[PDB]
Design a binder for this molecule. Structure first.
Ligand SMILES: CCCCCCCC/C=C\CCCCCCCC(=O)SCCNC(=O)CCNC(=O)[C@H](O)C(C)(C)COP(=O)(O)OP(=O)(O)OC[C@H]1O[C@@H](n2cnc3c(N)ncnc32)[C@H](O)[C@@H]1OP(=O)(O)O
Ligand SMILES: CCCCCCCC/C=C\CCCCCCCC(=O)SCCNC(=O)CCNC(=O)[C@H](O)C(C)(C)COP(=O)(O)OP(=O)(O)OC[C@H]1O[C@@H](n2cnc3c(N)ncnc32)[C@H](O)[C@@H]1OP(=O)(O)O
Ligand SMILES: CCCCCCCC/C=C\CCCCCCCC(=O)O[C@@H](COC(=O)CCCCCCCCCCCCCCC)COP(=O)([O-])OCC[N+](C)(C)C
Ligand SMILES: CCCCCCCC/C=C\CCCCCCCC(=O)O[C@@H](COC(=O)CCCCCCCCCCCCCCC)COP(=O)([O-])OCC[N+](C)(C)C
Ligand SMILES: CC(C)[C@@H](C)/C=C/[C@@H](C)[C@H]1CC[C@H]2C3=CC=C4C[C@@H](O)CC[C@]4(C)[C@H]3CC[C@]12C
Ligand SMILES: CC(C)[C@@H](C)/C=C/[C@@H](C)[C@H]1CC[C@H]2C3=CC=C4C[C@@H](O)CC[C@]4(C)[C@H]3CC[C@]12C
Ligand SMILES: CC(C)[C@@H](C)/C=C/[C@@H](C)[C@H]1CC[C@H]2C3=CC=C4C[C@@H](O)CC[C@]4(C)[C@H]3CC[C@]12C
Ligand SMILES: CC(C)[C@@H](C)/C=C/[C@@H](C)[C@H]1CC[C@H]2C3=CC=C4C[C@@H](O)CC[C@]4(C)[C@H]3CC[C@]12C
Lengths: 610, 610
């Protein structure tokens, strides 16, 4: 929760420990004062602290086995007392004794009758970035997550339910997977699977949490590669081993996820963790997505890319041959250079070429409607921020594709209603529609990690550098405008108006226009000093600083090009499996039923070991 | 072959193993059930699997020595039974027993009379990228490639022919060289040479395969540097060793390859493997090509470069002084600026300077004919794709040189036929002919690894980045054309026509022209927003991204500059040895016959060891 509230809670807990002499003796392991208190019978033994902790909780917290046994000899009901305050509600002495790995204290508490199924629904025991650890809500979950196998065996022998869930629905396998240390996690997973004598019901592995994730899916989502390898070791079958050639037969019941709302690969790719992209490098998943991409994903993606390119060619040809007529009125203003205008709806669609344009425009409108019908339910199937905010699963390409379809439909509306100004949505749709073709650059290895470079340059570096650049533009444009306020605009009109001054200074920042010079006339002397300062500071230092930032970003992406391209391949394959019809996408892998191996589907992997 | 077919074959093989109780007992090493089957006499013992494998093949496949001896005690004819299906045709139990290194099983099979010359012509035993290994087609080849020397000795003692070839003609030395692991390969090569008691016939080393490669040539082609060093250890003679100076005398019978169609160095350089360029760094080859390049290659290459430069000077001077006359007709169109045209064949070649031009044009046509006569039979001596598609042996320089000669001859044809439009082939030939002079940059160390940088930037990076760049050009050119469709073209004519809009936006992408600005008139407001987006996205992000890609490509080539330059030196020296007359290229090395060492030719290497 709040850091200040937890600090006040800890300070109040230490204050109530230091104020109470029984709690002070329990903390400091003062056996004489504690025995004088307990042998004495002032009739008080349940003094609670600031968090509602008993004296047994204080004895277990500071590793005081002798003081805890003294507190359990007299009035042993403290072995069945949880805390009664917000940051530690539900925590007993058994939880602290398990977390401190005091095995004799856990033995003594289970001898005195500790609650082995004590569900600690505390604020500090929830999975949150405020808490440093998430060990669970049960003593068995705590003992499995800490790493003491003997305490796990002791709690199981006393009757701790392995199939117990948290507030998030997580069983002990989920919280065991969620731990960062993974050396002992595989052995603890083996121990908890070995103690599943129940085996009735479904196996603990098939138990989903409240998010609907199995432990296999949670190992996929969180990027736990070691637990993923340990899980696939239990689901593989070595067919044969001849010399150095080992042929094994992995099971694809959970990896492929046939007939499910969210497949395993979709959950792996659409994950906020950076370590989830290493699951695609693992042994069954890499061969599975390579088979899917090489057999079905690449030809279908190339066909869709060719259709989209021809569609954009038709839209561009309809933009070029747009119906325009001569201007009716006279150009009274000498600075106005508009000689054509848009024809009316009655004036257009007359000749044969206009009917060809009508056919192409119907093709364009139908394609935009098809685009909207393909993209709109994906914003409601998952979250809008998740669908619009991930690099791997398209992302900004979907936003500009939906914007392109919306602008094409708006152009159609303005065409049918005889509204002037189709140049703005047609230019927007021509820029956005052609730039969306780079989405289909993710289907090729050489060009795919380039769109990721451009994405991590625009939203990565350009959105940070544009504030300093805009500050320099807003300074020097105002300076250049006020130096040329008392000047004739016919000789040097690059700073005549302040919007034009902003645009001209932006161009001079990017060095795409020449410096404003008119040597036939006498420019003001302040312009030369201001432009020398602009050339030193803006065009030389900051522009090449942005060039170096883009170079470092390109190097950072190019050091991990194949991983990002494989992630894009899996994202594209998942999207094509979800959206295309099922008869064009047969089920991947060996059928297995024709070979007598049941209804499961397998992937055969032949490797060259030693 | 196909991955799905091999997967179906393996699944069917495991299905037929699991269905048959004899094969199941042979796989699982169930001695009791197997003895009940064999001691029983249901009169069946040759049940074949899905691949035609016997029960002895299943026993040898899963390392079941006891089950294999039980299957060989009753009906031992299974020791002489190969498989009878496509992926394993010709494979016996001896092959699997050798590959599994079960020495007692190989002893038992040779005791029962296994076929020691069993030629396994299977689909899985062929050298292909589908197969993970290529161990050969014979049990001796399998035992030499796996690494068990005792099984090699056992097979040789029973009469396995060492001089046996595969479907590719490869003997056991070729397949032993083709293995990736090279520590045991030298010892196995020594063992197989030591067992060549035949020594009649030619030595196994001089036995070529179906591609015509000796094991020395195959070690050169595949880049096996360790086997190359081991082969040159057997062909060197240490003349003396005084202090730290060791003078040895390498033999150049196979490295130089006098009087052969394909020399050793040509096969090393024209190799698809990247590791073949390390053969040129080895001890005799480096000194040999350095002697050849320093004595003969560099002066002849500099003479040819000077002749080609003077030839291009003559061609350029004939292009500058091209016969042109005043235009006969009148310039009716105000946008037409053509004032000259080409003179007729009768009108030209009149004055003295025209006769000097005629002499130069005859020189140019003769040089192009000489160029075609030098380059045309090289396209038929080797493959066309091999000759036109390798960086080291010229490659694109040969294509542009042949194109230059073809365009010069086409210009001559258009000159003789009075056909208008010599400017197109003359401009093409002037661009391509002068750019071919960079071919002669490969003869100098400092400038040579620069043409490789440009080649790996054009075909490496430019051919990948040009699709995204063309996408941005096709978007923004159409946007800029439709914003200036309803505008007067006299004020801003950079986007008047769509081809001119494409060209102007390509120039604005490369920042070689200024931004289109006409401050005397009022430009449309959409142009400013579209050009600000073009300046942000195209000229700033993508152009400098391509700059960073070229920087990384230049760094990648510059980290290996000397290796690539030495490869180009060997390629140039091989080309000059092949194409120049023999009297200008004396045989390299010590003659040897005058010193009583036979007809062989030697290279003396003096090195400073310790
Ligand atoms: S006109 C209408 C269309 N217009 C659009 O463009 C719509 C589409 N646009 C969007 O909706 C947004 O761009 C959206 C929602 C997709 C958000 O942009 P993002 O998700 O593509 O941005 P990200 O790539 O995450 O930028 C954050 C940067 O921070 C880095 N970053 C974050 N944590 C990092 C860490 N720990 N170490 C290194 N880099 C880290 C990332 O690598 C990335 O690039 P870095 O590296 O800065 O160049
Ligand atoms: S107008 C008429 C004349 N016009 C012409 O230009 C004709 C001559 N042109 C041609 O015929 C072609 O260019 C031809 C046949 C010669 C093919 O081009 P290439 O063989 O020169 O191209 P390569 O250099 O192989 O490009 C492939 C790139 O892939 C890299 N590459 C391949 N595998 C790699 C690996 N494993 N690791 C690193 N780079 C690898 C290579 O290093 C190379 O450059 P990277 O590194 O990409 O910049
Ligand atoms: C390279 C591109 C060459 C384009 C040539 C255009 C041309 O010749 O212009 C012609 C066609 O004008 C058009 O509008 C053509 C429509 C296709 C444009 C996109 C081509 C993309 C090719 C695939 C790229 C895939 C890339 C994938 C990565 C004529 O245009 P104009 O002469 O301006 O006449 C206009 C007359 N009007 C104003 C009366 C209408
Ligand atoms: C992007 C900037 C857009 C600015 C638009 C200006 C505009 O419309 O001009 C108008 C306002 O002219 C002004 O002087 C506006 C004053 C604000 C300028 C700074 C805006 C910073 C915005 C926040 C940036 C934060 C960045 C933080 C990082 C009109 O100017 P004009 O048409 O030239 O008329 C001049 C007439 N006169 C000569 C008679 C006086
Ligand atoms: C038309 C003008 C007014 C302005 C709006 C135009 C903006 C275009 C050029 C910009 C806006 C956002 C840009 C953009 C958004 C995000 C991505 C995803 C990235 O992975 C590749 C580049 C890509 C695809 C680029 C392409 C160019 C876009 C679409
Ligand atoms: C430096 C960063 C922030 C980049 C991205 C922004 C550039 C700014 C300065 C650019 C982007 C688009 C430009 C722009 C849009 C359109 C017009 C209308 C035109 O008739 C006058 C110039 C004017 C008013 C300019 C002003 C400067 C703008 C707003
Ligand atoms: C004349 C115009 C129309 C066009 C066709 C001209 C193209 C020229 C400039 C281009 C085409 C291909 C280019 C090219 C091909 C390949 C190589 C081999 C490389 O190792 C060095 C650069 C070099 C030699 C370059 C030189 C420049 C060339 C020849
Ligand atoms: C971005 C990459 C793909 C680079 C290599 C390609 C550039 C394209 C856009 C260039 C290359 C040559 C250019 C070109 C060739 C010749 C002409 C004829 C001229 O009268 C009008 C422009 C026009 C029609 C332009 C159009 C744009 C072209 C085709």
């Amino acid at each position: 929760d709040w850091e200040q509230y937890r600090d006040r809670v800890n300070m109040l807990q230490q204050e109530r420990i230091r104020d109470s002499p029984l709690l002070q003796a329990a903390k400091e392991n003062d056996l004489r004062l504690l025995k004088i208190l307990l042998l004495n019978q002032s009739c008080d033994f349940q003094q609670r602290g600031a968090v509602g902790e008993t004296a047994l909780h204080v004895a277990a917290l500071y590793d005081n086995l002798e003081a805890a046994t003294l507190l359990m000899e007299a009035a042993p009901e403290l072995a069945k007392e949880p805390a009664l305050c917000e940051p530690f509600v539900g925590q007993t002495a058994l939880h602290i004794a398990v977390m401190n790995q005091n095995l004799n204290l856990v033995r003594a508490l289970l001898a005195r009758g500790a609650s082995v199924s004590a569900r600690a629904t505390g604020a500090a025991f929830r999975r949150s970035p405020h808490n440093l650890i998430y060990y669970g809500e049960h003593p068995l979950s705590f003992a499995a997550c800490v790493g003491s196998e003997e305490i796990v065996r002791l709690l199981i022998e006393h009757g701790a339910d392995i199939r117990a869930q948290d507030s998030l629905g997580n069983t002990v396998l989920h919280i065991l997977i969620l731990q960062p240390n993974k050396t002992f996690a595989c052995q603890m997973y083996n121990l908890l699977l070995s103690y599943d004598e129940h085996s009735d019901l479904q196996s603990l592995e098939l138990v989903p949490n409240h998010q609907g994730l199995t432990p296999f899916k949670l190992a996929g989502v969180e990027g736990n590669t070691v637990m993923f390898q340990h899980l696939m070791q239990k689901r593989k079958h070595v067919q044969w081993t001849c010399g150095p050639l080992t042929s094994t037969l992995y099971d694809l019941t959970e990896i492929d996820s046939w007939g499910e709302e969210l497949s395993f690969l979709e959950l792996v790719v659409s994950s906020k963790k950076r370590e989830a992209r290493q699951i695609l490098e693992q042994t069954p998943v890499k061969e599975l997505v390579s088979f899917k991409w090489k057999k079905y994903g690449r030809p279908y993606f190339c066909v869709l890319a060719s259709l989209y390119i021809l569609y954009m060619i038709c839209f561009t040809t309809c933009c070029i041959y747009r119906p325009l007529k001569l201007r009716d009125d006279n150009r009274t203003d000498p600075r106005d250079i508009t000689i054509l205008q848009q024809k009316l709806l009655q004036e257009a669609y007359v000749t044969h070429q206009d009917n060809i344009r009508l056919v192409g425009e119907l093709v364009t409108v139908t394609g935009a409607v098809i685009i909207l019908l393909l993209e709109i339910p994906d914003i409601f199937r998952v979250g809008a921020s998740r669908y619009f905010g991930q690099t791997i699963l398209g992302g900004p390409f979907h936003v500009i594709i939906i914007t392109y379809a919306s602008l094409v439909l708006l152009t159609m509306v303005m065409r049918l209603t005889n509204m002037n100004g189709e140049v703005v949505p047609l230019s927007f749709a021509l820029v956005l529609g052609w730039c969306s073709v780079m989405y289909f650059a993710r289907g090729f290895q050489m060009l795919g990690p380039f769109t990721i470079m451009i994405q991590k340059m625009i939203f990565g570096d350009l959105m940070r550098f544009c504030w300093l650049m805009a500050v320099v533009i807003l300074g020097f444009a105002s300076a250049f405008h006020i130096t040329f306020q008392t000047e004739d605009p016919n000789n040097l009109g690059e700073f005549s108006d302040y919007p034009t001054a902003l645009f001209s200074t932006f161009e001079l920042f990017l060095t795409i226009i020449d410096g404003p010079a008119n040597y036939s006339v006498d420019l003001p002397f302040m312009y030369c000093i201001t432009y020398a300062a602009f050339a030193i500071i803006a065009t030389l230092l900051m522009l090449n600083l942005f060039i170096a930032m883009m170079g470092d970003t390109h190097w950072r992406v190019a050091q991990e090009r194949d991983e990002l391209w494989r992630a894009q391949v899996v994202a594209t394959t998942v999207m094509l499996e979800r959206k295309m019809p099922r008869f064009l996408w047969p089920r991947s892998g060996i059928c297995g039923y024709e070979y007598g191996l049941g209804d499961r589907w397998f992937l055969r992997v032949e490797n060259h070991h030693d």
